[PDB]
Write an enzyme that holds these catalytic residues in place. Structure first.
Site, PDB file in Angstrom:
ATOM      1  N   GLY E   9       0.814  -1.201   0.000  1.00  0.00           N
ATOM      2  CA  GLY E   9       0.000   0.000   0.000  1.00  0.00           C
ATOM      3  C   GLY E   9       0.850   1.254   0.000  1.00  0.00           C
ATOM      4  O   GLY E   9       1.006   1.908   1.034  1.00  0.00           O
ATOM      5  N   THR E  10       1.410   1.593  -1.155  1.00  0.00           N
ATOM      6  CA  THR E  10       2.424   2.626  -1.279  1.00  0.00           C
ATOM      7  C   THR E  10       1.856   3.871  -1.959  1.00  0.00           C
ATOM      8  O   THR E  10       0.650   3.985  -2.201  1.00  0.00           O
ATOM      9  CB  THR E  10       3.627   2.074  -2.046  1.00  0.00           C
ATOM     10  OG1 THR E  10       3.264   1.871  -3.416  1.00  0.00           O
ATOM     11  CG2 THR E  10       4.068   0.746  -1.456  1.00  0.00           C
ATOM     12  N   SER E  11       2.743   4.822  -2.246  1.00  0.00           N
ATOM     13  CA  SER E  11       2.421   6.007  -3.038  1.00  0.00           C
ATOM     14  C   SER E  11       3.596   6.254  -3.972  1.00  0.00           C
ATOM     15  O   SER E  11       4.680   6.627  -3.517  1.00  0.00           O
ATOM     16  CB  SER E  11       2.163   7.221  -2.148  1.00  0.00           C
ATOM     17  OG  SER E  11       1.123   6.962  -1.222  1.00  0.00           O
TER      18      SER E  11
END
Lengths: 242, 241, 143, 244, 205, 250, 252, 243, 212
Positions: E9-11
């Site tokens: 769950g990154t950006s």
């Protein structure tokens, strides 16, 4: 010759020499006689002289019972015969399991011939140097069956056949004494004929003759001393003739 | 000469010798090309004599020095087809080692791997040895400059400095004399250019001949990368000395 | 360019799908005595209720080697995979030891497993039928 | 020493001197093939083949000696026809694979390396024989024009001018003379004329012959391999005849 | 995804500018609601000037990245430095051929002399799209309009750095799976540059 | 067909002898001499490190290799065969024993595995027999110290002291005249040095001799401290300085 | 080595799935070998649960003519006596299946053996045709008439090798040989082989079996046996009489 | 003849296999092993081939091996092939025990090993096993049993036999001095005398012999094997005066 | 070959018929410390009050695991054997990166069916390394890591008192305090503390029952 160093090479005259060499190796072993009677089959075998320090309790029998109604004898190499007998017994049990019917003599002879043929189809194997005599009765009637199988995979049906060393004399004796028109009606006549045929090449019939008798209904009785009685009676009759 | 079945495969002679391996060793020296390898304080230099007897041949396409990986360079003595085959095998082996073990392949391990392959060739009847001699040069992070050599027999070993070819004996003797004179076992120069110049002078003295820019092939292995010098760089080194 | 083994299922089945254990009396049926599998194992049971990891494990190293060969073909050419496969086939064909199942040293060297151990090596793996040298000879030579 | 007895009945056997005699026998078979030459001009490559006039029953349309691998690759060979045709097919497969993968025409050095590896792989086992063809190929890529020649041993080299076949030696001399006459450079049309001249000089065997010339240049064929048209072919033939 | 498997769950944000490309990301790895690692290096180096960021299953993406790096080392051993298109093609082939068993998504940022820096995106399923810029991850959904409104072609280095910093700061602010520091890699002709920004810097923008 | 099999490379002579094994023995007897002598509290293994043109580093190539922390080996014959056998022996020791019983194998079982591998090599139609002879020295809890010799045929024999290679008969006679039941490790090292001094044709220093000992446990070589039950390696390799110091002294 | 090189050289064919030999054989791409396999090959889905998939996609009645045909199996009774074997079935059916001849509910395996049809009709027809081919091959090989026990065991092994796959068939092999006499075996898809003297299968099996057992004798007459079979059938009409020379149809 | 000896799968014009004959002749270069079956035990005595005193005679495992608690083998020939076959026989015996919960009869194991050896003589890629085995065992079916197996794959049963380098002389000595009612002590004395008379070295010392006896009784009726240690061999030699 | 799948269907049939820790790693300026609790519980019952949860892959590479105990032990032993063989083959000190790669590939091969979550610490010639390894094949790098049921209290303690430049004594004290907090505040953790300290150029120091 140049055409005898492989089993896949044809000679200019149309012969395979490796098969002939295997037959020569077969003709080196002990004799083996099979006689077909009216309602019985007799297998005779020659045992080499037993050494003094040899255990006679568990000495192998030259006649092997493949099945309760089929017996087998061999001439040639003993270990190859053991391998063939093991395969034949396994195949007989497999056929009985698969089709609920015990093998017939012809079917088992054909299977043995097929194995011996398969062991000639490759350059990396040595064919069995064994000639076999298969005797028995089909498990539905009272018709004797005797077959001869050769190292090349050829199987034939005979009434009285000898294979092994000095088999020419026994074959001539059978030809001069056995008639297909009047086969020995009783078991005793066939056993006596087999013993007399074997005596033509055996130095001592008291300790070098083995007799096995196969009768219908899957009985198979191997004679013990009784062979000595037959030998003595044959000698007595011969001296009476003299 | 051989006698019997020991002429096409690798089996023991009655004198306990493998003739095919020896004949591959003979085949190695059929290119008539000599190579030199010397390790400096923080660099390694390989110099191969370059012969162009035919003027219809493009000089830039002649090379026996190969870049196996980022840090490892290889020099092959022998025919160029087996040289290229060994080069491809070494490239694949180094990449697979890096993928499987998480760090770059050192020179000694690659040399041992190639030697094991050579042993396979020398023991299997239906496989033949490669008639080439391989020399891997690098700057290992644990052992400094490193030169290792492997042969068709499956034997590999490391060298302080090595020479190969038909006239390798004279170069080896001169190197031994220099090492005895200095007794530091390496080259005291701290710049790879000076090491290249020293190797050029040593080769000139040993072979008793003078080379041009197109008669040499130079490869230099440093801590970070191994690179092959071009014609202009070799000419600059020659002009310097 | 596979990572997990794929297409591990069978599209079709037959009674004579295993030619090595065909009955001599009826060549179109398997021989249960020589199978030595207990005598109550129909082939249909091998199509359902299998562990979802057995196929992945049994075809893992083969898939990795095939991916490596594909990469070599893409980058190096046909000669490199051809030579690798040729060497592997030559090593495999010339080794025949009926009394052991352990792989040869040369095979492990070619597979780059000289100093690698997996659970296959630790756990390599009575019967009245089909466990002798002759059966293995027949299987090897196609007799 | 040209006949090594006892070490020449198998493909992958080293002689006591360290030589492979099957490879040298393949080279000898190459030496009996038709003469084929290749020249490298400033920005292109020219191939020339001296073919023997066969029966008139053959269709003069579909019979072409010079083989085409890719749009920028030309290839000729001397030796055994089946081996050369198979090698050309392998080269076509390699070029197709490279273009399908990397979306660009395969560079000539990479193609030469792949062909050399494939040819060398046939000298490693006793169940195969080395190819009996020497192949002169070339083309144009981003780096310029490349010309290579590949031997039955799997060894390939880049050449300013290459010659193979029966009349190789004299042809090579002529090629050397070319380098001694145009050291600075050479144009494509001059290359075609000189190829015709060299083929005419080196075909003196007798049996009438024909000449087939193809070229691939950036400034003349947009970096594509095309056969020389009738006008320029006749001009080259006339120039070769006048030079003699 | 599989039960109990770590999800990324990154950006992620890759932006192409006049002198090359910049690839930036956050540094948070979560386990639903507990932060397993406050500082992570999500910028994966496949080649010297070819980097990527991963989303989906962590194990599958790591295996794919290792295989692609091995493939690019093999390619470099033969033909020298590869191109971003080649690496994107290898990533796409690996992801598409294995989409039935592996969950993986990649963003590839590269630079080369011919193409002068490029961005490719490979979402779940195994399709490759070449874009001037790309955003991915859980927080990327909160900055679609902002990035759309504030993107220009051929921006300077500082303008692109500020754009990525602002966009990632907003993504971190509105998303619970985005972490403290911002890591950016600048790929240009001069070389590879690494930049790091701390919460006390961008939270005051 | 003619491709699915290969004929046996090792065959019997009419006299009843295997020619390839005899030729492998001949190749072994042409190699450098390697010796091993067992004491009452250790075993000593020694060999001569013959070198190529004096530019190679002798330390890079080691003719004595650790098989297990308590078992080491030396060879006479061909180097690559020894290297391959050493790698295979280490792998077999880990797979067959360490991963099963949690313990390293005893000396006899590892020697038996090596002999089985060599015999399988001699029974193959695709490979030739190995061309090395191995002296393996080890220690185990239930059998003390042990020294074995393995031939290219796969036959292994125990030895109180032995030597193989060029100078083997003379070395065997010298060791027979020197060995006694009350010998100790230092006396064994001295006798091994004396035996090697009669076989080296060049410089008899520590740079051309490789020597290893199966003596007592070495806690300093274990690599970690904290477990009294765990013991250090029982196999040690003597450095050049130690060998030189022993050479200068008695 | 050349084949190895070919195997590593290259998409359109792969997507068509023509790179597999089985697909080429099943589509007759390169020959008619599909019609040359003595043991037929059956296609299964390439999924983890073929059995449940087939069960779900078979127990879905949407088209009456797309369903698998089921044998009638109203009432079939077979018995043996000194004169041979008497088999009696029902000639009961219409259903848009107008035909020139009546539907045959007894499979003619060979001129000496009869096979009752029950359960799935297609399974019985196909596998009894295969059994007849196997028996003919066996007779050619052994130069003798194959026993009924051998054929029944062959069929039992065949149906057992696919146990639980989806076959639904139950047959009664009836024959007369000089070796054994009159023999009746029952083989179902589960794998049960049962030798018997009186067999009754169908919806009205109980009444027919009771009628048979009421007046069953080993020593009877052909007319008496036929009348008893017809009466047992009618209690709940084709007749077959099997003797050593073969089977004769006595339908009424 | 060299025309038909290269391969193991070629019949001679006379119908002979030369490789098998050469393997059989290779037995004559090995030490002498003797097996004597008494009315209450079996005695196996083998002569080593020690040429140096540096050999370790304490580890007396060269000719006599144990296959299980009831079957032992005397080896004549190559030791490595013998070890391979012995490991195979041990595994087979353990498999039989696991399958049937009964100890394998001696004849079955002998036949299995003979089949393996014969199979190794039928493939062109495998050379014959140049070893000979003397099997000594006990089972409930035939009591005490003594067998011999050769490289050709043939096995025979005997009362007293020898295999090795002096087979003829040892056989003559056994024939002249064998009685069917002898005990274990008489068999031990006969074996020692036969080894002493048929020896290459006059000094029949303890460190050149391997001895084993399989006897009934033990606890109450059990059968146990005893492999004599060198001290026991020395004591028996002193008792017999051979020393 | 390999792990067997036999009796899988039998086990499922029986099942359908009703037939049935605190670890910390702290990286300090010249090495790494790994600490663990020493209580083994078979559920509510304390099976052992002093158990060694610190396992060794290499003389200077140690690890501690959680999840399935048998799987963790087997995987650690297999990787240790592979590392020892690799070091013997290369004649070099093993690297933590090599062990990480082997563990990652082995765990990814079985697609998460081998349950073993590890903290692996070590020192090799390239420096000091500390990694966390998940059962599915994903690995992470950190300066301080926690694992087990008491990992939350340990992480709180580590976050409270961690600095960039820590001495050996400070790192040992911090690891001991984290394990103590896990012991006191978590029911699954108890008893003593086991510590293993690894510096650069020095032997690994293994202290069992460091704080009783």
């Amino acid at each position: 010759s140049g055409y005898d160093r492989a089993l896949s090479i044809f000679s200019p005259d149309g012969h395979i020499f490796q098969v002939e060499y295997a037959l020569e190796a077969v003709k080196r072993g002990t004799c083996a006689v099979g006689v077909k009677g009216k309602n019985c089959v007799v297998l005779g075998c020659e045992r080499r002289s037993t050494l003094k320090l040899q255990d006679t309790r568990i000495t192998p029998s030259k006649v092997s019972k493949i099945d309760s109604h089929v017996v087998l004898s061999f001439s040639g190499l003993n270990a190859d015969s053991r391998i063939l007998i093991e395969k034949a017994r396994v195949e007989a049990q497999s056929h009985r399991l698969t089709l609920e019917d015990p093998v017939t003599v012809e079917y088992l002879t054909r299977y043995v011939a097929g194995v011996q043929q398969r062991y000639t189809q490759s350059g990396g194997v040595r064919p069995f140097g064994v000639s076999t005599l298969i005797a028995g009765f089909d498990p539905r009637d009272d018709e004797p069956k005797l077959y001869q199988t050769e190292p090349s995979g050829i199987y034939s049906s005979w009434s009285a056949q000898t294979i092994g060393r000095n088999s020419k004399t026994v074959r001539e004796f059978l030809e001069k004494n056995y008639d297909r028109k009047e086969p020995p009606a009783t078991v005793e006549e066939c056993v006596k004929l087999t013993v007399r045929s074997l005596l033509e090449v055996v130095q001592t019939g008291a300790k070098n003759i083995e007799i096995t008798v196969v009768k219908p209904d899957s009985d198979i009785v191997a004679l013990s001393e009784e062979i000595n009685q037959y030998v003595t009676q044959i000698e007595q009759e011969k001296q009476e003739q003299q | 000469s051989a006698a019997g079945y020991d002429r096409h495969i690798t089996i023991f002679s009655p004198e306990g010798r493998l003739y095919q391996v020896e004949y591959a060793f003979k085949a190695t020296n059929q290119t008539n090309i000599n190579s030199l390898a010397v390790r400096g304080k923080d660099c390694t230099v390989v110099i191969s004599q370059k012969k162009v007897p035919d003027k219809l041949l493009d000089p830039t396409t002649v090379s026996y020095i190969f870049c196996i990986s980022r840090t490892i360079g290889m020099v092959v003595n022998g025919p160029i087809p087996d040289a290229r085959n060994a080069a491809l095998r070494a490239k694949a082996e180094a990449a697979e080692f890096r993928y499987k073990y998480g760090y770059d392949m050192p020179c000694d391990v690659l040399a041992k791997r190639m030697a094991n392959l050579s042993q396979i060739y020398t023991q299997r009847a239906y496989m033949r040895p490669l008639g080439v001699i391989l020399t891997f040069v690098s700057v290992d992070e644990e052992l400094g400059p490193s030169i290792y050599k492997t042969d068709p027999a499956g034997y590999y070993v490391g060298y302080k400095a090595t020479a190969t070819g038909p006239k390798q004996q004279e170069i080896t003797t001169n190197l031994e004399n220099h090492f005895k004179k200095s007794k530091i076992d390496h080259i005291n120069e701290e710049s790879w250019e000076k090491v290249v110049e020293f190797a050029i002078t040593h080769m000139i003295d040993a072979l008793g001949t003078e080379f041009s820019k197109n008669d040499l092939e130079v490869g230099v292995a440093t801590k970070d990368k191994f690179f092959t010098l071009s014609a202009e760089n070799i000419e600059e080194r020659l002009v310097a000395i | 360019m596979n990572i997990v083994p794929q297409d591990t299922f069978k599209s079709q089945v037959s009674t004579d799908q295993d030619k090595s254990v065909l009955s001599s009396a009826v060549p179109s049926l398997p021989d249960t005595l020589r199978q030595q599998e207990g005598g109550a194992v129909p082939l249909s049971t091998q199509l359902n209720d299998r562990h979802p990891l057995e196929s992945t494990l049994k075809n893992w190293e083969t898939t990795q080697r095939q991916r490596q060969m594909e990469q070599y073909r893409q980058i190096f050419g046909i000669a490199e995979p051809m030579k690798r496969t040729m060497e592997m086939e030559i090593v495999n064909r010339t080794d025949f030891n009926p009394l052991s199942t352990n792989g040869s040293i040369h095979r492990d060297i070619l597979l780059n497993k000289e100093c690698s151990i997996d659970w296959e090596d630790v756990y390599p793996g009575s019967t009245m039928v089909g466990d002798d040298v002759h059966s293995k000879i027949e299987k090897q030579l196609g007799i | 020493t040209s006949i090594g007895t006892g070490y020449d009945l198998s493909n992958s056997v080293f002689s006591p001197d360290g030589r492979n005699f099957q490879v040298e026998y393949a080279v000898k078979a190459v030496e009996n093939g038709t003469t084929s030459i290749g020249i490298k001009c400033n920005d292109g490559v020219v191939f020339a083949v001296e073919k023997l006039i066969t029966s008139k029953l053959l269709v003069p349309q579909k019979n072409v000696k010079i083989q085409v691998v890719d749009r920028h690759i030309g290839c000729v060979y001397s030796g055994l026809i089946p081996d050369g045709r198979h090698l050309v097919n392998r080269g076509r497969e390699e070029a197709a694979s490279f273009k399908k993968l990397y979306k660009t025409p395969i560079p000539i050095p990479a193609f030469a390396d792949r062909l050399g590896q494939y040819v060398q792989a046939h000298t490693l086992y006793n169940s195969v024989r080395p190819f009996g063809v020497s192949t002169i190929f070339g083309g144009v890529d981003k780096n310029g024009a490349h010309l290579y020649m590949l031997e039955p041993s799997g060894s390939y080299w880049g050449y300013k001018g290459a010659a193979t076949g029966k009349g190789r030696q004299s042809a090579k001399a002529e090629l050397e003379k070319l380098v001694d006459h145009h050291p600075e450079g050479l144009s494509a049309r001059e290359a075609v004329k000189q190829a015709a001249k060299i083929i005419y000089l080196a075909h003196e065997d007798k049996k009438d012959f024909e000449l087939e010339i193809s070229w691939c240049s950036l400034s003349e064929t947009n970096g594509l391999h095309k056969f020389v048209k009738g006008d320029l072919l006749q001009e080259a033939i006339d120039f070769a005849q006048k030079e003699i | 995804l599989k039960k109990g498997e770590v999800s990324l769950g990154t950006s992620i944000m890759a932006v192409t500018f006049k002198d090359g490309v910049i690839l930036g990301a956050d540094s948070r790895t979560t386990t639903g609601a507990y932060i397993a690692n406050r500082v992570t290096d999500k910028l994966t180096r496949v080649h010297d000037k070819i980097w990527c960021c991963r989303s989906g299953s962590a194990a599958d993406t790591q295996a794919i990245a290792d295989i692609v790096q091995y493939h690019l080392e093999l390619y470099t051993s033969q033909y020298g430095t590869p191109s971003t298109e080649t690496a994107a093609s290898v990533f796409k082939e690996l992801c598409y051929e294995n989409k039935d068993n592996l969950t993986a998504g990649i963003i590839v940022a590269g630079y080369d002399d011919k193409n002068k820096g490029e961005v490719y995106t490979i979402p779940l399923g195994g399709s490759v799209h070449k874009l001037p810029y790309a955003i991915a991850g859980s927080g990327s959904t909160f900055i679609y309009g902002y990035c759309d409104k504030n993107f220009r072609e051929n921006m300077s280095k500082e303008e692109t750095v500020d754009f990525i910093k602002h966009s990632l700061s907003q993504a971190i602010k509105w998303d619970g799976s985005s972490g403290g520091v911002i890591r950016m890699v600048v790929l240009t002709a001069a070389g590879v540059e690494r930049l790091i920004f701390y919460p006390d810097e961008y939270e005051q923008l | 067909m003619t491709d699915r099999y290969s004929f046996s490379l090792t065959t019997f002579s009419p006299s009843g002898k295997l020619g390839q094994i005899d030729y492998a023995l001949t190749a072994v007897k042409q190699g450098v001499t390697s010796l091993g002598i067992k004491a009452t509290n250790g075993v000593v293994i020694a060999t001569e490190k013959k070198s190529s043109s004096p530019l190679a580093m002798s330390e890079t190539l080691s003719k004595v290799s650790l098989l297990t922390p308590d078992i080491g080996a030396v060879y006479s014959g061909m180097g690559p065969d020894y290297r391959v056998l050493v790698d295979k022996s280490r792998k077999v020791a880990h797979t067959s024993y360490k991963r099963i019983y949690g313990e390293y194998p005893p000396t006899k079982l590892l020697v038996s595995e090596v002999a089985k591998i060599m015999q399988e090599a001699t029974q193959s139609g695709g490979v030739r027999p190995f061309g090395v002879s191995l002296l393996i020295a080890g220690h185990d809890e239930f059998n003390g110290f042990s020294l074995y010799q393995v031939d290219p045929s796969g036959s292994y024999f125990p030895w109180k002291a032995t030597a193989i290679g060029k100078g083997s008969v003379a070395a065997k006679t010298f060791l027979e005249k020197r060995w006694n039941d009350e010998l100790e490790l230092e006396d064994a090292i001295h006798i091994a040095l004396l035996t090697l001094k009669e076989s080296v044709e060049g410089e008899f220093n520590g740079d051309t001799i490789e020597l290893a000992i199966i003596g007592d446990e070495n806690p300093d070589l274990l690599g970690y401290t904290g477990i009294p039950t765990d013991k250090g390696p029982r196999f040690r390799k003597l450095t050049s300085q130690e060998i030189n110091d022993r050479l200068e002294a008695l | 080595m050349q084949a190895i090189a070919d195997s590593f050289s290259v998409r359109l064919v792969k997507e068509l799935q023509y790179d597999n030999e089985q697909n080429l054989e099943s589509d007759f791409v390169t020959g008619a070998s599909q019609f040359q396999r003595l043991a037929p090959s059956l296609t299964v889905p390439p999924i983890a649960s073929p059995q449940q998939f087939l069960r779900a996609h078979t127990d879905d009645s949407r088209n009456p003519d797309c369903k698998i045909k089921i044998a009638h199996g109203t009432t079939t009774l077979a018995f043996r006596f000194q004169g041979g074997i008497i088999v009696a079935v029902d000639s009961r059916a219409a259903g848009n299946w107008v035909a020139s001849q009546t539907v045959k509910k007894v499979i003619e395996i060979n001129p000496f053996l009869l096979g009752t049809m029950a359960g799935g009709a297609a399974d019985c027809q196909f596998w009894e045709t295969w059994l007849g081919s196997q028996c003919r091959l066996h007779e050619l090989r052994e130069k003798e008439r194959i026993s009924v026990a051998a054929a029944s065991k062959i069929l039992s092994n065949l149906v057992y090798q696919y146990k639980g796959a989806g076959l639904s068939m139950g047959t009664m092999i009836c024959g007369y040989t000089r070796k054994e006499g009159p023999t009746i075996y029952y083989v179902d898809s589960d794998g049960t082989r049962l030798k018997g003297d009186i067999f009754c299968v169908g919806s009205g099996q109980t009444f027919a079996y009771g009628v048979l057992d009421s007046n069953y004798k080993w020593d009877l007459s052909v007319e008496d046996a036929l009348y008893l079979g017809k009466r047992s059938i009618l209690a709940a009409v084709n007749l077959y009489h099997v003797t050593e020379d073969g089977w004769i149809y006595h339908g009424n | 003849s060299r025309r038909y000896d290269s391969r193991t799968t070629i019949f001679s014009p006379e119908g002979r296999l030369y490789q098998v004959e050469y393997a059989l002749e290779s037995i004559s270069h090995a030490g002498t092993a003797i097996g004597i079956m008494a009315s209450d035990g079996i005695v196996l005595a083998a002569e080593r081939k020690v040429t140096s005193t540096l050999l370790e005679q304490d580890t007396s495992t060269e000719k006599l091996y144990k296959l299980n608690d009831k079957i032992a083998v005397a080896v004549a020939g190559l030791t490595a092939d013998a070890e391979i076959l012995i490991n195979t026989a041990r595994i087979h015996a353990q498999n039989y025990l696991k399958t049937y919960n009964e100890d394998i009869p001696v004849e079955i194991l002998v036949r299995r090993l003979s089949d393996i050896k014969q199979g190794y003589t039928q493939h062109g890629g495998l050379r014959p096993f140049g070893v000979s085995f003397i099997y000594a065992g006990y089972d409930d079916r035939y009591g005490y049993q003594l067998y011999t197996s050769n490289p050709s794959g043939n096995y025979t049963g005997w009362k007293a036999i020898s295999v090795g380098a002096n087979t003829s002389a040892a056989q003559t000595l056994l024939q002249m001095d064998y009685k069917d009612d002898m005990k274990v002590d008489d068999a031990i004395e006969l074996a020692l005398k036969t080894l002493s008379k048929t020896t290459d070295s006059s000094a029949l010392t303890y460190d050149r012999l391997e001895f084993a006896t399989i006897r009934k009784g033990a606890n109450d009726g059990e059968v146990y094997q005893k492999i004599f240690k060198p001290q026991e061999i020395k004591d028996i030699l002193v008792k017999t005066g051979i020393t | 070959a390999g792990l067997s799948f036999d009796n899988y269907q039998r086990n499922n049939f029986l099942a359908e018929n009703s037939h049935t820790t605190t670890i910390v790693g702290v990286k300090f300026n010249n090495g790494v410390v790994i600490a663990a609790d020493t209580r083994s519980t078979q559920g509510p019952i304390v099976a052992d009050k002093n158990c060694a949860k610190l396992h060794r892959i290499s003389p200077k590479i140690w690890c501690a695991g959680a999840g399935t105990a048998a799987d963790t032990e087997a995987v650690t032993q297999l990787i240790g054997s592979n590392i020892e063989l690799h070091s013997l083959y290369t004649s070099r000190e093993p690297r933590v990166v090599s062990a990480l790669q082997m563990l990652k590939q082995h765990l990814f091969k079985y697609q998460g069916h081998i349950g073993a979550y590890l903290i692996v610490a070590g020192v090799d010639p390239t420096g000091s390394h500390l990694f966390s390894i998940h059962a599915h094949g994903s690995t992470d790098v950190g300066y301080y890591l926690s694992l087990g049921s008491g990992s939350l209290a340990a992480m709180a303690v580590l976050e409270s008192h961690w600095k960039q430049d820590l001495t050996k004594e400070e790192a040992i004290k911090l690891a001991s305090d984290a394990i103590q907090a896990g012991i006191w505040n978590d029911l699954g953790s108890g008893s003593n503390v086991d510590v293993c300290v690894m510096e650069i150029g020095k032997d690994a120091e293994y202290l069992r029952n460091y704080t009783p």
